[PDB]
């Protein structure tokens with residue numbers, strides 16, 4: 001019979017975020033109290049923590065830096081500063097020089113329509129090596145490289161993703177795991 | 181003379197978000213608090229067969245304005261419009277809600293979203309089941325008049341307001357003031 | 372896309388950067404049970420003759 | 421198995437099914453690393469943009485570092501994802517927020533010789 | 544009172560990536576071509 | 592990934608094009624109401 005003296009309401013938390021402590025206890029020393037030995041078997045206080053989370057410092061960015069000169073193939077200017085506001089915001093630029101040094105990447109290999117550069121040996125082999133069926137577009141005859149259609153390795157794409165060491169979530173896809 | 185009073189009220193509100201199987205777990209809560217193992221496995225298979233794209237990271241929507249007529253001007257005006265949208269109906273305007281309730285703005289009306297096992301007009305009744313620490317947390321006030329662009333800085337100066345920390349709860353988390361660079365009409369509309 | 376914890380095959384796109392087949396699920400439970408019982412009995416008897 | 425873990429008491433029946441499901445679709449647990457700048461090799465101008473990417477990675481490591489994040493309550497490893505710092509909880513810890521290398525120093529002045537140094541502290 | 548905590552880890556099948564002549568993906572090689580010639584840390588951090 | 596020529600939707604692109612050149616909060620308010628304030632970059636799809 002301990003709840004006969006109802007516990008008071010929980011007091012205010014001791015601090016805001018760092019560390020919190022609150023306690024509660026209306027016990028009257030009447031005949032019922034002294035004749036039932038409630039002093040020895042019943043607790044007189046209950047303590048527990050409150051707001052056990054840390055105190056995260058507010059994300060504080062810095063002022064913008066000087067405008068960076070632009071010489072890309074796309075007229076965009078960079079502006080970097082060190083949250084909900086964008087980290088780096090790019091705007092249209094006034095380019096002193098437009099795109100240059102544009103040429104064909106492939107020299108002794110085949111140039112896929114999507115930009116990929118694969119060896120000419122991989123053309124007309126009954127397999128989509130470019131990704132957009134560019135090599136197998138109009139092949140009059142193809143050489144069977146594999147006798148039977150086999151299934152791919154399951155979850156093979158997970159071992160091709162990039163890894164961002166800083167973020168703890170590795171990254172999106174960087175390598176292709178369907179090419180053979 | 182003998183008198184006896186019996187009163188027991190038990191209510192459950194399951195939330196199973198499996199399109200068709202979502203209602204099964206909600207209906208099974210009648211007299212069965214523990215979830216069925218087979219029903220849980222069926223709901224897991226359903227959730228595997230249907231994604232739950234919620235709980236993902238966000239990015240500023242106005243950044244997607246890349247190749248449109250008057251692209252950069254429209255992007256800057258959408259920046260300004262999103263700022264005005266964010267600060268026109270921010271929850272700061274609404275008065276604080278009782279029992280740590282969270283206020284929202286739907287058009288021109290405030291709504292005190294009540295914690296579970298609570299109800300009332302302003303989340304005042306039904307404090308029987310709190311299961312929390314308690315107190316009164318802090319809430320950020322509405323941003324004051326913006327800076328007149330003396331040197332480009334900002335003059336938001338978000339300070340405390342009518343709901344101060346009283347019940348021992350933590351104060352409003354975040355920066356007190358803000359600082360940025362005035363656009364100067366966004367470099368006089370991009371050079 | 373290869374078959375990972377799903378259907379036979381799936382087709383991605385250029386705008387989509389990645390598809391993942393890592394199934395990770397979490398859970399949490401907080402069950403409580405209590406009982407408070409009270410019993411007070413009093414009796415008296417006085418006889419005078 | 422995750423659902424039955426509420427009253428598992430060291431269950432073993434569903435362990436075989438869970439192992440079969442893991443063999444069907446596993447998750448990356450252990451792994452070795454290597455610089456991503458070595459993957460760009462078959463582009464038109466490889467060496468130029470490769471050196472540019474190395475410089476960009478140097479400047480990004482100078483900008484963002486794991487030391488910038490606040491430490492964790494119990495030996496946690498803080499990681500920087502965007503503008504927030506999350507603590508990686510080890511085995512035996514839980515919660516939303518659960519020695520380590522400190523921040524590097526500024527690059528010293530370029531001496532008369534090639535030798536230029538940078539100092540990190542394990543504080 | 545009683546408290547029991549369990550953990551486990553399985554070394555399921557793996558694979559070793561080849562050292563050289565790795566075949567890049569479509570989206571990566573496409574994004575890798577839009578990079579400017581002159582150094583620009585801002586646009587280079589995007590692909591990072 | 593965010594930085595690319597992401598193929599926008601027909602209604603989204605149409606409403607973005609119908610926005611007036613001069614600053615007008617009226618159309619941008621309805622656009623923000625219909626389309627929201629942010630778009631998803633990355634993250635899992637775990638249920639609740």
Ligand SMILES: *[C@@H]1O[C@H](CO)[C@@H](O)[C@H](O)[C@H]1NC(C)=O
Nearest residue numbers: 188403404405406407408409
């Ligand atoms: C008393 O407590 C026990 C504890 O398990 C419970 O099973 C029983 O239903 C309770 N009886 C009541 C509240 O009348």
